[model samples]
Target chain A: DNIKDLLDWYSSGSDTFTNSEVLDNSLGSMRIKNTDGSISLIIFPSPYYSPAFTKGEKVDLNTKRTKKSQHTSEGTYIHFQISGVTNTEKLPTPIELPLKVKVHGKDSPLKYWPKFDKKQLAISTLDFEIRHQLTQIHGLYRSSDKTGGYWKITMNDGSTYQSDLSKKFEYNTEKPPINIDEIKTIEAEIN
Target chain B: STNDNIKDLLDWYSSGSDTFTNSEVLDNSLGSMRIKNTDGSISLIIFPSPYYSPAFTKGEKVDLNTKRTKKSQHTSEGTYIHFQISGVTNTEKLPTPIELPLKVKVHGKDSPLKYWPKFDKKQLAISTLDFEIRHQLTQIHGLYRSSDKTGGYWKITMNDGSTYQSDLSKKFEYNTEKPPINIDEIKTIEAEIN
Candidate 1:
């Protein structure tokens, strides 16, 4: 039961995932086994992709995003430890574009989030042991005080897909940019 | 209707005619092969899995049925079922029957016809959850004749722990072709088919 729950959360973006199939991040597709043991492939945003099937609904996975003004170059993210505590602040969140959070030292792009634009790659990642086992989430973060305004976007259907992190920029900038997220604080917590 | 269909599958597995019409899923985890009986009734049958596991996991290692050989005795232990796990801080282990990913070359012989499914992250755990305590999930009952040489029975596992049972007794081919020679195993043999 717990295993299924974990699996459900693993593929929470998809309800059409099943049929003893293989989830391939590389192909951005699912490979389903036929009754005779042969496999059939289903690509991302395809028949399983609900938005594709719905009438007159299209997704903008590719954005008009450029590194013109995004403040990743000057922004410095300090590595923080949860140390077996509630350390959501230090959690290294994954963003697609490399130019989004440009830390000069460890900007090595290790992975790309699947089923999205190729250029929109994973700027952050997870260490299975550190994230889940030890600290249950040791991650990189720039303080809200220094410059902490990463993008938080939502689709029309209301699923804030991790891959959908890429959004259109009205004006890309060289200056330190302000953070943009949905449901911003109204009055601001004064405590 | 689904219940009746599943019941039909088990029934056809035992007494249905040799004529196979097509194959489809009984459910997400269970696959079924439909056979056309002499009376024109569709007999549904389940195929055996390529993987095998012991009925219980109460102790350290589960021993396999293949008798060890003196020639191969130099090897440490080739034929045995053990648990594969992660994130285990406690001594407690998984429930029986623990699914082994690969099929054994029992007796070091490949079947005349074969079907090997791919492996995946999910061990075939839910397949045997229904059975009280069976030897292994595979059921190789008999061999049947056809236009060419007929063959005996065997099974293999897919990546997910789904049961893929097929009676190779009468229908000698599937998907417009005969099966290829693949590694196979027999969990338990009561008596040979006549």
Candidate 2:
């Protein structure tokens, strides 16, 4: 009963990518869930073998077979300490980052997914409004024009979001319509 | 329907111009005839008058010539010219009146000087065009307008998810029968459960 309770608590924090029961019986490095919402400690099981079973291969708990046999033995005991409880509410919710346009004179920074490099943060979806008169340059020189507009952009996968213009910018110099001091665009994301 | 009522209305409108009926004629010519109203305001007269008749030589005329014509037995004592109409002002008046089989003007403003209609015909014209466009959209397939012509399209979505788009000076056609999108295919993937 105690083992079941421990497993339930561990599974509560587990995502679809990781499962508690799968890691316990598998012949690999055992990953331990730290109390502070992090996983850094690894403990290897005894009598370990490389590539113990093929994908989708099931381990039988009652079968006490040796390493040399066709089937391997599963360990029934687990080592763990009730260091503390985890508040599920404090768990970090995933958010998409890296937008196509800048907002409030700055671009949103990439966060949460530290595994991938900065270049991997590709835009999957975008929706926003462009308020105030702006010179909308369409890459080509002749197609550029000034306007106040809005748009909706959709991607194939990842986070789906919407944004809108919040304020307008004022220009200072007549020679350059887009001055450094002026801020003409604003955005807010809704998912 | 009655010319008597129409003429009566016109006489009432013109009665305010009694100040001009007693003015002295000055420099009467074919180009223009100048006159002064009884009060301070002056007027340029154009209607036929007897003061400037037969001044130029016979068949000899100048750009500002004077001429006369035969008198007609038919007098304008009770005749109506439709100079003013009810529910309409000079600004809203068409070059030609559009008369239907049973409609008639029944009311008018007889203010001494104010005669312009209060209705906004320009906005009403656009609203009528919008109603016709919606009717046409209901009969055809989906519609999609390009953004480059006007730079970009603006779509306003209300709290209830109802959306409206700006005018499409240039447009393209979509396959769906109506706005938004519809699913056309469905498939199920087979995966092993462990």
Candidate 3:
């Protein structure tokens, strides 16, 4: 399932794959963003609450706050409410977000990240620190630390704490689950 | 028949230090509940939960974790008062049977805030408060006695006609009549009477 549509989508001579941007793995297709500004996305698996699960990250209920980043003056920032996909219809249905492979900085106008840690590359457990800054509410920031370059997420609204994670987070790709692929270019656009 | 002389003898025998004293009448009846002191002074007395034993009939000294008994213009329901027997007599003329009282005190053991009566549109206000019994009597039953957990103490429960005797802590309800049949009415009452 991870490599079903990769050959046709990434190989040459395919109009739909060639004209449009194709960030594909050896198996399935991945979306891309053109115009070269450098992007990163955190993708998670679906039906995440299953019991006999093998992959995907699962956090405990009592994990209230996490620490990240050594740059900020006020230590690490805190983020709240990392839940699974929701339903809108009468009958419940599961729609997984694409497992996006986050690529560090590889742009011209700007620059990609200097170093990458594979441990940070594939994060099953995300860490966040608490921050209550008025102006910078819900500001998601990556750490400058190389080895453990974790992200700090903030979730303080104007008044009380907010529960909506979707409204706070801004992701690069937003669709049904897609395979994560390794691309080597900068002028790519995701469909 | 010289009845005139006999009446004076009867009056002389009935008359004690007080005019109301009647000792020779031999008529046994419940008189005014009063405690006669050693100095021959009588004072009215009241008692509740008279039958209390660590083993036998331990009283229902439960500290109601509920609000007070809010049925009226009395402070006894909402306050904890020591319920005790002041005057008790178990003589041939007066048998000291179990007598439960309708009055009790509300002190100690975290009695909650006083509840103000509620008022409806018709000015009829009522509030059934809550309370908890502080000391509840847990009877040691046969199952507990025969086990290795048994000490030297065991509780006794009276069973008139029921097929089973249940623990009081558990849901136990008997359909038999209230004001249990007079113990004196039974023919075997005097067989073991001392």
Residue-by-residue lDDT tens digits, candidate 3, B94-164: 23342211111222122222221221111000010100010111111121222231112112122353221
**TM-score of candidate 1 on Cα atoms, chains taken together:** 0.19
TM-score of 3: 0.15
Candidate 1 chain A: worst-modelled 10 consecutive residues by lDDT:
A80-89
lDDT of 1 by residue, B62-148 (tens): 111111111221211111121111111111223333323333232334322233222122222222211101112122312222212
lDDT of 2 at B143: 18
Question: What is the Å distance of residue B32 in model 3 from its true position?
Answer: 48
Docking band of candidate 2:
incorrect
- The per-model DockQ list reads 0.03, 0.00, 0.00
The 10-residue segment of model 3 chain B with minimum total lDDT is B123-132
Q: For every model shown, what is its TM-score relative to the native structure?
A: 0.19, 0.12, 0.15
lDDT of 2 by residue, B1-194 (tens): 44333233222322221111222233346634443222222234333223213232221211211111122122122111111111100112233432111111112211121221222221111111222232122122111111111212223333355443433222211111122110011011111101
**Of 2 and 3, the candidate ranking higher by TM-score:** 3
Off by over 4 Å in 2: A1-191, B1-14, B20-26, B49-194
